[PDB]
């Protein structure tokens, strides 16, 4: 349980974070797809004091697609909820941007929905 | 310089305060236009330190959970976005509001919505 | 003729939709199983010759929740692909905009996803 | 107030219809207003907003084929049209264009427009 761990999505990307006391994220992100190799700093927050009605755990994170292998001039932000259960689940929705001149401004964000469990798909 | 670091102000009275540092981060509050210790909070996010040379924006995204010493309303914002520079400099960004629920109103759970940042508002004398 | 028929989602909801030649989508939305107050119309359009290389086939439609019965002042729109064979499926992303006062136009909108199959659950 | 012909920020036009049923049909076209940019559109709207001071929700859909191009891609756009003064129509919206499952993760870019019955500048 909780939220520090590793994590993958349905892609089988690698999500390895730090839940602090303080509500920060940290930790590092490595995708399955996309202009991506290795692994890419990250940065979030959580709420560490969530509901006690039931209710999953909001929280958000981070990753600019530059590391000291690459740089795909973009950044994908996570927002979604953590929820405890049986098999743990991290829901999420996100968007990612691409640097674009202002005439390519209007498709510069792709949206998508991830959803994170301890397990890594086959 | 990444032209980022700095005050900016949304659209409908937010304020943010951030600098960007030379590893990629973004550290900073967000908080009202009346700027009371209420309505601050702390964010995080990432931007590219290293943008194209081709005329292209520079992207970034940041998150706050909107929990404080003060408050908690059980929900975080990420904005995604990028950078624009020159005469009329701006981060123009989308964002997604999600609130912690239960799985029955887990479809309920998800805000959309976009946010244009600028270096300056109006401000008027006393 | 793939899409032509009957769409369960996970959540209770059915709806049965005609792909009409000219690229059109129409038909019935129900949000609740076993509730004739729940149907409503939809409406919208497909991409009429699409490829066929195994990309899906893209579509949207939207919904406003009104009906005689009942209304949400809200309106969904579904934008996504069909993907076809033996284990069919509709891959959406939605848009949820309720009417607002201006003061309330931030909070309008719910985003979310959402998978219809033709098999019913 | 909804029928008329509305312009976004970009200048793409959009003539629009809105029927008695809540139908909302017309087409969506560019700026240069040639043939070849111009589609068909359906969608749906509240034919009963609130009165409250709230905006009227609706959506409607556009794909990206006609008779001389195809984008094998369609959009939504979800929103609600605020009246008075200067009406506006401010909407969200999302292009999903088809692609395989695996690169699914990348079919769909969002955006919002905001459409007005003049002309953008």
Do not use: M
Not at 33 to 59: C, F, I, K, M, Q
Not at 66 to 84: D, E, F, I, L, P
């Amino acid at each position: 349980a909780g939220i520090t761990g590793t994590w993958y999505n349905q892609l089988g990307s690698t999500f390895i974070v730090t839940a602090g006391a303080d509500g920060a994220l940290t930790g590092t992100y490595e995708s399955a797809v996309g202009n991506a190799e290795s692994r890419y700093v990250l940065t979030g927050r959580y709420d560490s004091a969530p509901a006690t009605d039931g209710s999953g755990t909001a929280l958000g994170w981070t990753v600019a697609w530059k590391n000291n292998y690459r740089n795909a001039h973009s950044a994908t932000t996570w927002s979604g909820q953590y929820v405890g259960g049986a098999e743990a689940r991290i829901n999420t929705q996100w968007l990612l941007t691409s640097g674009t001149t202002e005439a390519n401004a209007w498709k510069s964000t792709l949206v998508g929905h991830d959803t994170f469990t301890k397990v890594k798909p086959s």
